[PDB]
């Protein structure tokens, strides 16, 4: 009654890395193990089956290793395209069917910083007619995936009505996010300037829009 996986591992580009699933006499010990990869926003893909066997089209950078209550997946020649979540799978004689590992998020450590692109939209004419005003701040193509988003009104810090999404991995291993400043039409007209301030890795990119 166990299937432990490290939630996060990381390796250096061009090197080897191991992902291990630890268990007991009921799971990996005595039952076959499969491995699966899930890139961001896509469906899982069969890595290794029958502990050692890879289907066709699969890269031979990957391989599975058996030894008792431990199963391991190895990735040679690590590349940035390998950043994904990796799961193991095996039956357990304590429950009735298959158990998935917790999943291991793989990070590749050699990637350079990318500063974010910031696009700020004022509220539409249609929304102001409904007496509302949503300012949209779109944050794209930044690495690593951490930003702080602050809002300003006439240079002064805004303290309410801000909601920002968690960063999300995109196609090219960079990250994207968005932040919304939800106001009424009167609040939007009450100031001369509104600013979206994006702090990434210590530097700040500010974009400003005006009701006029």
């Amino acid at each position: 009654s166990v299937l432990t996986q490290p939630p996060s591992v990381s390796g250096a580009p061009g090197q080897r890395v191991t992902i291990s699933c630890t268990g007991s006499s009921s799971n990996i010990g005595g039952y076959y193990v499969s491995w699966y990869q899930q890139l961001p926003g896509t469906t899982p893909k069969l890595l290794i089956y029958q502990d050692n066997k890879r289907p066709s089209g699969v890269s031979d950078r990957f391989s599975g290793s058996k030894s008792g209550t431990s199963a391991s997946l190895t990735i040679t020649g690590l590349q940035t395209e390998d950043e994904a979540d990796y799961y193991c799978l095996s039956y357990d004689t304590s429950f009735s069917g298959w158990r998935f590992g917790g999943g291991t998020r793989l990070t590749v450590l050699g990637q350079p910083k990318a500063s974010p692109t910031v696009t700020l939209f004022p509220p539409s004419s249609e929304e102001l007619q409904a007496n509302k005003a949503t300012l949209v701040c779109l944050i794209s193509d930044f690495y690593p995936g951490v930003v702080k988003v602050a809002w300003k009104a006439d240079g002064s810090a805004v303290n309410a009505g801000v909601e920002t999404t968690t960063p999300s991995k995109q196609s090219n291993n960079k990250y994207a996010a968005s932040s919304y400043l939800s106001l009424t039409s009167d609040q939007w007209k009450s100031h001369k300037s509104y600013s979206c301030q994006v702090t990434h890795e210590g530097s700040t990119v500010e974009k400003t829009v005006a009701p006029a």
Partner: peptide, 15 residues
């Protein structure tokens, strides 16, 4: 297309 934000209203919005 950006992932949606979830407001405390319980309503989503995306751009």
């Amino acid at each position: 297309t950006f992932p949606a934000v979830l407001q405390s209203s319980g309503l989503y919005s995306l751009s």
